Amino acid sequence: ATYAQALQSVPETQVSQLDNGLRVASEQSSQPTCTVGVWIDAGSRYETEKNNGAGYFVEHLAFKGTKNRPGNALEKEVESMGAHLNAYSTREHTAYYIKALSKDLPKAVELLADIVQNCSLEDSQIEKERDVILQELQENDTSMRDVVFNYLHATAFQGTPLAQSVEGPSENVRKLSRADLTEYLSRHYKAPRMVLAAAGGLEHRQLLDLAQKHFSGLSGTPTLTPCRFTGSEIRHREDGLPLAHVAIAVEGPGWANPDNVALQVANAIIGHYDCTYGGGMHLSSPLASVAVTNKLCQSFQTFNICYADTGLLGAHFVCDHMSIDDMMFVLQGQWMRLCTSATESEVVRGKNLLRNALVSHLDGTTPVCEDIGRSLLTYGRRIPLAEWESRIAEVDARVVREVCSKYFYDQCPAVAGFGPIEQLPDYNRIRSGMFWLRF
Amino acid sequence: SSKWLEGIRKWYYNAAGFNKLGLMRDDTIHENDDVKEAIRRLPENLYNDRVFRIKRALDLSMRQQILPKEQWTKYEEDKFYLEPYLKEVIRERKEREEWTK
Amino acid sequence: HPQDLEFTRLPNGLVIASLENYAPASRIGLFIKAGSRYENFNNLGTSHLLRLASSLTTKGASSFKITRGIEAVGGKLSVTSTRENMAYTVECLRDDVDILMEFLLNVTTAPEFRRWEVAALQSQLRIDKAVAFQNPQAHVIENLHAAAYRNALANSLYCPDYRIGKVTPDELHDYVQNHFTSARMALIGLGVSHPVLKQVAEQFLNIRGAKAKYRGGEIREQNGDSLVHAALVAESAAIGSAEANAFSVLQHVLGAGPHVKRGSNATSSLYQAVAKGVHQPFDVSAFNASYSDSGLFGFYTISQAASAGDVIKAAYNQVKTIAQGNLSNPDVQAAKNKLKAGYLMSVESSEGFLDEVGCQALAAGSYTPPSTVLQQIDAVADADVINAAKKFVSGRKSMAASGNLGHTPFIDEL
């Protein structure tokens, strides 16, 4: 086979609409199982000040009492069909999906309609699950990496609803009401904003029929404001921590730019390292070779995350506090090396790694249906793989130095520092060493 | 012919002087970092013998005194041990250069 | 899609299972019976040392050439191993498999393993063992296998503390010479064609311990960290038997990992009956460790220290009331469907599909399609389930425990 044989043999992922605002879509596959999910474009971005944590509350509350079925007869029937059920709510996008077997397909779509539009809520449930969510905040308080990323958002987006944490402050947790929670339910789920995405052993005819047969009666019939990336530093000195967590990020381009794909090439070149790899002194990544050489980092990840035309072009390293400024120095050195002297072989290696990560990512059931759901909540469309091969072939080192001269070179950062930050330099050192005066 | 070049080699090895302090061939090598890698990668017993011969040589040159006649390391029975290891280190050096260019 | 698998067991001892499908993410697995049970008390830590030794100089191509070339074509190489097996998995694009195949050949059949890199590998062993045992459950499981084998299956997946440094690479090279023989290699491929692997596996390998009994007993660890872990297992069922499949349906009846997140183990009746028994935050599961010549089965408990043995008694009485035939039969059918979903959703991807298809291929000798295996899940009588539970009750015990063990009984009050 070849590249035309690679890109030629490909499914097409049929989409449609129901005239209720229901964007339905599916991709056929060859496995004897399926995953049917609803992606609702409603996270922390679609809230107010006074109800931080409503969406988190719903995705932890929508499984302990439905309308027709009692206290746990939903989950009872879910383990009766023998299938997986998952829900996760990001800052803008919320997912409720069922990983199920092909035979219980109308049961699957009916139970998904029960989860989406047919939830009951009891005040004993708000009581007990309020206690449960305070337990879950106790759980989240030591998961350090999420503490870092919540710091990063909570300083980068002063004012806007993007810096709302999904969990919300606990004093916004223990004062809620079911009427205002359902008022959020009744204002922020309604006409267009939901994709019924399915993947696997079904048909778009079949899923279209079940969509018309189950979800008809959603009766769907005024948000999405810009975001001011402020850019600053937040720091949490706490020396009862052994490992130091530092993240630094600048403004992300978003979705309406192929500069997203350019930064994917660049952060395929720089990328990630952990202390548990095989072969340290022979890594192609120069940052990785130096960080093995002088034994600097425990781990790092240099990556992209984007929201709608905004977001965090990010980097996150964990290391001991007696080695922080060295790691920061070599990190900014590799960033400016890509800014000025981007030659060809590194661009070639990054495009190979982009091929590998993208193809091996888009696999399975949940990554496929996840891709399609978040694509058709944001884009209006799904990207085919010919588009990925084309937008890999479009970008060379000249595009790299254009994108690096715009996005990195003397831009104000957001630095989230956590732990033993005693060596971690002042913000003006990041500013003055952020560009180069050609040294 | 080929016998004459070897005789020049034997003369030069005797007139070089590092057989009069008991040293051997691979103990006079000037250090780059490639030499330091080759010294790092040695087996333990020859490393100990290397440091003993070096320490006797520094002693004898401290009192500026040559060994007797009988303890001179005669020609082409000295162990030519470093050239495999240093050869491979320089080979990996050439490998890095030819891969990154 | 008119395409399906292709097989050839090359009769001088090796297996090839190619699957030319149209997926770009091509994977090559190479599966060997070289796990911990082929390593004994005088060379422990050697399979762990071999696992982290993926990226050294091989005969012809040094580690620089290997690491930089494989990263330049962008392939990802992962190596995974169990107590029975090793597994070299190289994942990449569909078109770039021949040079990565030659690097796989070098990794296998070209050993040099030089001494300074072995010292760096010792440091790597210490770091890897820390990253392993910083999560409690795997510590409990290695204690559990250590408490139920009087022979080589009790050994770790890792290096013990006293094998750091004291291991030399010529021990590894003799381990190569006596166990990496050509009759022990199952080469499975997703996205590659049969004649490619046929030429490579035919021309390019060219080389050519005892049974484990039942130890019985317990291993305690006073840890004092407010999360008591306790695992209790008896010896149940070796590989191949629908008896072991009946133990699998039994652990579905008891309860496995929650199929619903933020649930409370709905049809998983262990946690229901023990939540009825003990009104606390805790966490209970079942577990089954099947291997080739023997097997194991039991339950696992995370609990608070103050209510641990109460949970152990309650779930033990649950095992007794199920082994004395007090249950329902379509619930056994719905749990058979749970194992149907589990087996069909252990083969969603390319990767786990590769893994268990090749491990079944190396274990059973030939390939078996999944649909008749699903038929064999549904086609086991309920008397097999009841006799399997009664066999678990009738047997001996094997208990590993860790945590604040001041409120957990030993044997008699289990």
Ordered DSSP codes for C273-295: HHHHH--SS-EEEEEEEE-SS-E
Whether residue C52 contacts residue C124, with contact meaning beta carbons closer than 8 Å, is answered with yes
**From the centroid of its chain, how far is CA C127?**
22
Query: In this complex, how many residue pairs, one in chain A and one in chain C, have their CB atoms less than 8 Å apart?
Result: 129
**From the centroid of its chain, how far is CA A421?**
27
Cβ-Cβ contacts under 8 Å for A192 (sequence gap 6 or more)? A21, A23, A220
Which residue matches tokens 């149209």? C22
Mark yes or no for CB contact A279/C63 under 8 Å.
Answer: yes
Q: Which of B75, B85, B87 has the alpha carbon at shortest distance from B18?
A: B75
Q: Edge-to-edge strand order for the sheet containing A22-28?
A: A15-18, A22-28, A194-200, A33-40, A94-101, A84-89
Which residue matches tokens 């009666």? A217
- Distance of residue C264 Cα from the nearest chain B Cα, in angstroms: 57
Mark yes or no for CB contact B40/C116 under 8 Å.
Answer: yes
Whether residue A3 contacts residue C95, with contact meaning beta carbons closer than 8 Å, is answered with yes
Cβ-Cβ contacts under 8 Å for B9 (sequence gap 6 or more)? B75
Per DSSP bridges, beta strands C398-403 and C217-222 are: parallel
Beta bridge partners of C403: C222
Q: What is the C-alpha to C-alpha distance for residues A38 and A41, in angstroms, rounded to an integer?
A: 10
Max Cα–Cα distance, chain B, nearest Å: 53
Residue A299 DSSP SS3: strand
H or E stretch including A345? Answer: helix A344-361
The partner residue sitting opposite B95, judged by closest CB among C65, C115, C116, is C65
The partner residue sitting opposite B41, judged by closest CB among C64, C68, C116, is C116
Which residues of chain B neighbour C115 with C-beta distances below 8 Å? 41
Q: Which two tokens stand for residue A173?
A: 């947790």
- Distance of residue B58 Cα from the nearest chain C Cα, in angstroms: 29
Beta bridge partners of A34: A100, A200
**From the centroid of its chain, how far is CA A359?**
18
Whether residue B37 contacts residue A281, with contact meaning beta carbons closer than 8 Å, is answered with no
Q: Which of C282, C291, C281, C250 has the alpha carbon at shortest distance from C268?
A: C250
Beta bridge partners of C77: C90
Residue A394 DSSP SS3: coil
Chains contacting chain C through 3 or more C-beta pairs under 8 A:
A, B
Which residue matches tokens 């995405």? A197
Q: What is the C-alpha to C-alpha distance for residues C30 and C10, in angstroms, rounded to an integer?
A: 14
Q: What is the C-alpha to C-alpha distance for residues C144 and C412, in angstroms, rounded to an integer?
A: 19
Q: What is the C-alpha to C-alpha distance for residues A255 and A309, in angstroms, rounded to an integer?
A: 6
Structural gaps in chain A: residues followed by a C–N separation over 2.5 Å: 221
Q: Rounded to 5 degrees, what are φ and ψ at C201?
A: -65, -20
Whether residue A369 contacts residue A195, with contact meaning beta carbons closer than 8 Å, is answered with no
Angle at CA of residue A248, ends A243 and A253, nearest 5°:
145
Q: What is the C-alpha to C-alpha distance for residues C303 and A209, in angstroms, rounded to an integer?
A: 47
Mark yes or no for CB contact C266/A9 under 8 Å.
Answer: no
Which residue matches tokens 């935050």? C281
Q: What is the C-alpha to C-alpha distance for residues C221 and C401, in angstroms, rounded to an integer?
A: 6
Q: Which of A291, A287, A333 has the alpha carbon at shortest distance from A439?
A: A333
Q: Which of A297, A298, A294, A267 has the alpha carbon at shortest distance from A281?
A: A294
Q: Which of C15, C19, C33 has the alpha carbon at shortest distance from C366?
A: C15
- Alpha carbons within 13 A on the beta-carbon side of A73: 9
Experimental method: cryo-EM
C55 touches chain A (CB under 8 A): yes
Mark yes or no for CB contact C65/B96 under 8 Å.
Answer: no
Whether residue C194 contacts residue C5, with contact meaning beta carbons closer than 8 Å, is answered with no
For CA atoms C130, C135, C141, C144, the dihedral sign is: positive
Max Cα–Cα distance, chain C, nearest Å: 66
Q: Which two tokens stand for residue C343?
A: 């087996």
Whether residue A289 contacts residue A270, with contact meaning beta carbons closer than 8 Å, is answered with no
Cβ-Cβ contacts under 8 Å for B78 (sequence gap 6 or more)? B24, B25
Q: What is the C-alpha to C-alpha distance for residues C344 and C338, in angstroms, rounded to an integer?
A: 10
- Distance of residue C116 Cα from the nearest chain B Cα, in angstroms: 6
Nearest CA in chain A to C262: A60
Residue C324 DSSP SS3: coil
Q: What is the C-alpha to C-alpha distance for residues C387 and C280, in angstroms, rounded to an integer?
A: 32
Residue A314 DSSP SS3: strand
Q: Rounded to 5 degrees, what are φ and ψ at C188?
A: -115, 140
Q: Which of C220, C201, C204 has the alpha carbon at shortest distance from C18?
A: C201
3-state helix, strand, coil in chain A (%, to 5): 45, 20, 35
In chain B the first and final C-alpha atoms are separated, in Å, by 43
Mark yes or no for CB contact A76/C267 under 8 Å.
Answer: yes
- Alpha carbons within 13 A on the beta-carbon side of A382: 22
A344-361 helix and C63-72 helix, angle to the nearest 10 degrees: 70
For CA atoms A378, A381, A382, A386, the dihedral sign is: negative
**What length is written for chain B?**
101
- Name the CA dihedral angle for C105, C109, C113, C114, rounded to a multiple of 10 degrees: -90
Q: Which two tokens stand for residue C56?
A: 């050294």
Q: Rounded to 5 degrees, what are φ and ψ at C28?
A: -120, 115
The backbone region for A313, taken as left when phi is positive above 0, alpha when psi lies in -120 to 50, beta otherwise, is beta
Residue C303 DSSP SS3: strand
Has A59 been annotated as catalytic? Answer: yes
Whether residue C253 contacts residue C395, with contact meaning beta carbons closer than 8 Å, is answered with no
Cβ-Cβ contacts under 8 Å for C2 (sequence gap 6 or more)? none
- Distance of residue B42 Cα from the nearest chain C Cα, in angstroms: 9
Nearest CA in chain C to B39: C116
Q: What is the C-alpha to C-alpha distance for residues B93 and B89, in angstroms, rounded to an integer?
A: 6
**From the centroid of its chain, how far is CA C109?**
25
Cβ-Cβ contacts under 8 Å for C151 (sequence gap 6 or more)? C37, C210, C211, C212, C213
* Rounded alpha-carbon distances, angstroms, from residue B72 to B2, B58, B66: 26, 16, 10
Whether residue A153 contacts residue A251, with contact meaning beta carbons closer than 8 Å, is answered with no
DSSP state of A66: B
Q: What is the C-alpha to C-alpha distance for residues C176 and C205, in angstroms, rounded to an integer?
A: 13
Nearest CA in chain C to B96: C64
Q: What is the C-alpha to C-alpha distance for residues C155 and C151, in angstroms, rounded to an integer?
A: 8
Catalytic residue among A27, A47, A59, A92: A59
Angle at CA of residue C299, ends C295 and C300, nearest 5°:
120
Q: Rounded to 5 degrees, what are φ and ψ at C32?
A: -130, 140
Q: Which two tokens stand for residue C231?
A: 């695992």
Q: What is the C-alpha to C-alpha distance for residues C63 and C117, in angstroms, rounded to an integer?
A: 10
Q: What is the C-alpha to C-alpha distance for residues A201 and A103, in angstroms, rounded to an integer?
A: 10
Cβ-Cβ contacts under 8 Å for A217 (sequence gap 6 or more)? A117
Q: What is the C-alpha to C-alpha distance for residues A378 and C319, in angstroms, rounded to an integer?
A: 51
* Rounded alpha-carbon distances, angstroms, from residue A384 to A14, A103, A123: 12, 29, 47
In chain C the first and final C-alpha atoms are separated, in Å, by 55
Q: What is the C-alpha to C-alpha distance for residues A396 and A262, in angstroms, rounded to an integer?
A: 9
Q: Which amino acid is at A370?
A: E
Q: Which residues of B9-37 are buried (b: 16+ CB within 10 A; e: fewer)?
A: eeeebeeeeebbbbbbbbbeeeeeeebeb
Cβ-Cβ contacts under 8 Å for C373 (sequence gap 6 or more)? C343
How many distinct helices (H) and strands (E) make up chain B?
4, 0
